[model samples]
Target: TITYTSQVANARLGSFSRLLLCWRGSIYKLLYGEFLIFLLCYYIIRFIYRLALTEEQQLMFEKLTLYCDSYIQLIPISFVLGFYVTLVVTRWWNQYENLPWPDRLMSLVSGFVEGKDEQGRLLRRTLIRYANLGNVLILRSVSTAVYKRFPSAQHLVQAGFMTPAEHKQLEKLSLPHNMFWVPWVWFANLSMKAWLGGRIRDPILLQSLLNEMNTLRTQCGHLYAYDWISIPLVYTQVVTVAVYSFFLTCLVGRQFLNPAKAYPGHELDLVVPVFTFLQFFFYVGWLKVAEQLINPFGEDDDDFETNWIVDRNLQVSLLAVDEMHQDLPRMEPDMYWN
Candidate 1:
């Protein structure tokens, strides 16, 4: 069955909605991909890696991890560097909400070019770009360094942690240790986002921006030679509380937390999926932010300035159509003192 609504049916509003949702889903989808979720899961993987390691391995891991974090700090550092982005956009939203749609869109475009009176949108974007570039460099540098230091640690890898005879089924896992590739992919994502977002506001600047992002992305291309370079690092929320719950149940003297205690040990599989649900459940949401940064026009707060972006396109279109040769004829009889 189909439902009709006045809002979607209105000619202008419906058309605008099309543009809005078009950009929104485009950005949101990029953010929701599983590869990035795996990247995020990397952090979880790090914690678990440490948790499961032998003492000497843990020591080397910590030192290596610290070095990696030092190089890696820039990626996250880049995000916070643009912390005021939301504030600027939110301010713009408030400033323009009651204005006619024409004024609202134009003001945003004008502000980006002519400089905002109090608006920091442009500032936020620039900082974000620079910081993101720094992050990309550091991430690539660190990842490569890690693999170089651990040449024989195949057991530390995702499927590499499996059996030798089991490995025979797949015999040769001749994957290059392209740990750098994961960060390179991330950098590519950022480049695409910045290019697209910047293009929306100023098509005139597009070629230059694309050229620059190309240089940056190309520099990180070697990171792409390995498929196993990235693995999902699931968030490790401690399930220790379940043991506590069971203890409490025992304290009550009647039964265990499972109440169905004496349950078959292998049946533990069912219980484990329950705890895992929480970690994986939020996976899509966590991935969206990194993806949004890589793709900046969506319904999410982390998205590009779509309303302004489209309006800017409209301004150019209108100016082209009108030739922008004359100001509107004076409004009043005297017009002005001049």
Candidate 2:
């Protein structure tokens, strides 16, 4: 979503300053709409206090403003926001950590499983395809963007992730659960067949492959579980309601009264409400981060690029297994060698 390459940022002197100018996927783009609305509401109240109210009514409004400010302190805005954001950020990192990487499994397959013939190449390709298929199945199940691309098992066939025959076989399985692991089962079965054919040299190697594959499956499993047992809706609701409510109250609570009258905190009538606007930016921006990040699979500007990840995994695994298998660049010594 929001991808600022680390190399470019590191190379540039004013990278963060340049980032602020970026319109797409920028904080300004996200914050400006709400900021303008808050400004509008602030001015409307200010207008009412200045122009609409008679002197007696103005005095009542001042007392009302003081009461609003007094009670606003009673809400635990900072404490609630602090804990909620911390939990949300932790969940985001944990989700990233559990994301499946096919490199280790591909390395094992390419190194241990042997053959050079067309049949051997086909076997290797098929094995890795199954691995990618299982991954796509799991991802599409949890990720909105992936699911939209391959909406049905048939689409998986069209996309070359699943074969027509495999799609039929998958359809026949009557499990009342997610069939993401079905391709995984096929991968294991095929690996055993490969072992029996002497493609894999020993039972121990076969067991190792099985263990590594299961590790990949477990990553997928964790992704599924995270999707299933998400951060509680009640907690999100409480945090969201509290943040907005606190800010909504701030619209009145932070209003400037007659400076001539010398009401407390109303002595300085800085018409722009610069500090109050900054408060709106910070609080709302804090909540926006949690909202954008709570589910990393979504299409937010800052969300994980699921389609790119899918493409990269498929490409890298295939290249590692097929193109780079026992194929080294040259065994030349480095310049440091005598």
Candidate 3:
């Protein structure tokens, strides 16, 4: 995602202004298209009123504009947009939090699953690989970026997340449900075997390994759940309709009518609807925030970095369980030792 936290670290005078200057993933980029469209429509309506209409028609149009302006505020666009965007934002952050990380599981496996020989190394590597495999499997289902990278089980095999033999086995099991959990089953079975064969010497250590695996598994399940269940369509529809319709009314309602006629709020003819455009920016920008965050796994500029996450998880987990396995620094006494 866009990382601008460092820019605002000290909250200098222009810190907020500096953020406004950003182009990619900025509200200006998101809202500019619709803003231009709104302005185009507004000016077109204004031109038609000024150049095309008769005096009688002008009076009728002025009454219509006044009527629209009077009633548009009653739509409660702010309230609906506020609640809906808040819900979307909350779910967005929750999905980020639920993204599975194998750090805890890797540490447990590295520390507890004793392995230095080839067979021992194989066991430890395989254990952590299974955890990561399940992670990629779930992420592929939820994230567009990850899915594009690993479009099928074949890609997973080619990438070393799964072996061809395991892929064949996975294919043989013709279950209709999601098979992401299959690797975790393999993980549990392997951990049990390690305990039985004495690689995992202590029962308590084996339990801890399995417990951490379960925790990782649970996180994967949470990600899946978030993907499966989404914010209600009705609520989205309501918010969208409210924002669009409110602005639709604004196109006519917000026009600067001729001051000579002297309508209640139409005392000035500024030609440019400055505050109206600003209202459009804020309201539509608010809606855009919800739109971008509603499905954060997509390829938006500010979406979660799922592809990087997949690579990082695999590299880090393997490093932790294999390269860093039992590789402690040399012990030395501090200068203050008595």
Candidate 4:
């Protein structure tokens, strides 16, 4: 659902402007709730200063506002917010790239592990099934949406990601931590057996298969590592404190001041400070980006489409190993052929 890179690929004048109006995965959608809350609080403060307070109290409030305004420049929100979010986005992309994919391994298995027989098909299918199951396990552990669907091993069995026999064996087996790695152990053992059975033709081919499996295993381990260790608490806390403090300061610093009181920069009272609200929208939207991207495994408008990924992975993995195995379309000369 979140695709628009091509729409604005040409550097036309209004190409980028058109994207701002889109609702889904837009900055406005993610930040609107916080934006409204900030607006409400800002107006509440305005109402108190303008009408609720007596003249003497209003004067004291004016002094306090001025004091806050003087110090708002000291927050340095842009520098801190920029750096923190940069780190988060880098980590987000790394997690995406490290996600375990069965495509490469499946391709190798289909090409090298040769036979047109039923047993050949069975070996190929089982190998990919084990590979996919391992990925599902890790994905379920890390992604909230995935876990909700496959809440436990029983759900995996019901969903067909796990067979009944595998489920029974898994229940009997216990480990101190997540058992996402168990299926890969089965994958390795089964793959080696296939090589010994003379199904895989050459030692080099078998070695290639093992190496590819190890690569897949390493990716799964990296994904688990990303889930286990997150961005530090101190960095997030600092960014959070900076965001709120700067905005809270804006609530006071941005209110209209009386010019008749002989202040040089203030003569007009804006019933609504249109410019300030725009500023808040931009700054808060910036901070909100960090929040949304920090944990993309969670369900959000622009988060990783993990549920879609789970479905697509299984569908493609099955199709690749079964339907497309030793199957190719008839060759014909292209229009450009000499």
lDDT of 3 by residue, 1-338 (tens): 99988787896787798788889999988898999899899999999999999999988999999999999979999999999999999999999998988898899999988869988889988999999899999999999888999899899999989988889889997599999999888988999999999999899998888888888888889899889998889999999999999999998889888899887878878988888888988999999989999999998899999989889988998898888988998999989999
TM-score of each: 0.22, 0.93, 0.97, 0.95
Cα deviation of 189 in candidate 3 (Å)? 0.4
Clash number for every model? 4, 0, 0, 0
TM-score of 3: 0.97
Best by TM-score: 3
Please write out the lDDT profile of model 4 over residues 91-188, one tens digit for every residue.
89998998777888888888887887899898888888888898899999889989998888899889878899888777778878899888878887
Report lDDT per candidate. Answer: 0.35, 0.85, 0.90, 0.85
For candidate 1, the per-residue lDDT at 159 reads 21
Q: Which stretches of candidate 4 lie over 4 Å from their true place?
A: 331-338
Q: Model 4: how far is 219 from its true place, Å?
A: 1.7
Per-residue lDDT, model 2, residue 119, is 71
- Winner on TM-score between 1 and 4 is 4
**lDDT string, candidate 2, 1-338, tens digits:** 77778736475676677666687777777788888888899899989989999999999988988999889978787788888899988988888887888888888888888987777677777888888898899899889989999889888889878899898898898599999999788989999999999898998988888888898899899999989998888988888888888888888888888899998788888888788788878888888888888889988888888889889988888888898888888899999999
| Candidate with more favorable, higher lDDT: 1 or 3 | 3
